[PDB]
Design a binder for this molecule. Structure first.
Ligand SMILES: CN1C(=O)[C@@H](N2CCc3c(nn(Cc4ccccc4)c3Cl)C2=O)COc2cc(C#N)ccc21
Length: 267
């Protein structure tokens, strides 16, 4: 019952989303996931999973604050982050300075390392799922419910993304189990996007052409990064988008290089 909220508890981009303010805690974001008839037998599963992901407390990971389970409405509640996702921030009129970009990355590394410690594999890491608060600090999100079996099915019910960050072992092979190294690939392409200030592959249509190109070893154009980018970061993104997953490092491994690096070079 601890993660159960309801509409009467509440006063009242992104999508079909509404802002809200609960009594005790500060400001919150609410999204309605499903509208339709009551599945009922698939409710105990929804709450058990809602409390399982409520356990994920990290300053760089979005916390599920609660879930509204009413007659027809099924909704989720999360922490507020005012600057939006990382891309919208990167595409802004004012440029984000190097030192900020470095911290952002360190924050992404920490949050992914915490999730891998708890056993959660993100599956859909990208700039849309990196949320930014007022002081340019970040939290890792999952706006497409990729890590939440039951709630995603609830979203994709009868009665109710972008492949640029996906590891090539998952492209055209849907039956392969995502590993911790799958996120490491995605992280690499995020690193590109950060210093390129845009989505990769000229934001071109997700063709069979592009999929086979990536499976054969093509990557985002490093030459397209026109602003200054530290060599340590260029080395890391190339290391992390290696075709062979064994060649990619682990997020604990990444943090050990990068934390000492950020503090001296970038901060
Ligand atoms: C309101 N809202 C959400 O709460 C949101 N959501 C659920 C809870 C949650 C979230 N990320 N985490 C951290 C995390 C845990 C494991 C793996 C990866 C990350 C946790 Cl835990 C998260 O992004 C889902 O639905 C939305 C969709 C849209 C759109 N479109 C907007 C808002 C929400």
């Amino acid at each position: 019952n601890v993660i159960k909220m309801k509409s009467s508890d509440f006063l009242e981009g992104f999508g079909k989303v509404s802002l809200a303010f609960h009594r005790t805690q500060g400001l919150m974001i609410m999204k309605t996931v499903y509208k339709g008839p009551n599945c009922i037998e698939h409710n105990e599963a929804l709450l058990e999973e809602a409390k399982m992901m409520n356990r994920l407390r990290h300053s760089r990971v979005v916390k599920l604050l609660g879930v509204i389970i009413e007659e027809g409405k099924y909704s989720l509640v999360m922490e507020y982050m005012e600057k939006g996702n990382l891309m919208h921030v990167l595409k802004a009129e004012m440029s984000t300075p190097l030192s900020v970009k470095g911290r952002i990355i360190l924050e992404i590394i920490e949050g992914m390392a915490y999730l891998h410690g708890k056993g959660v594999i993100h599956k859909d890491l990208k700039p849309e799922n990196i949320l930014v608060d007022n002081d340019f600090h970040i939290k890792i999100a999952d706006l497409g419910l990729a890590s939440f079996k039951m709630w995603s099915k609830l979203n994709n019910e009868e009665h109710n993304g972008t492949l640029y960050y996906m590891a090539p072992e998952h492209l055209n092979d849907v039956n392969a189990k995502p590993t911790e190294k799958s996120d490491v690939y995605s992280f690499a392409v995020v690193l590109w996007a950060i210093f390129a200030n845009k989505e990769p592959y000229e934001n071109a249509i997700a063709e069979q052409q592009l999929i086979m190109a990536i499976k054969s070893g093509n990557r985002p154009d490093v030459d397209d990064i026109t602003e200054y980018c530290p060599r340590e970061i260029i080395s890391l993104m190339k290391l992390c988008w290696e075709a062979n997953p064994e060649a990619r490092p682990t997020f604990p491994g990444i943090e050990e290089k990068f934390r000492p690096f950020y503090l001296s070079q970038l901060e």
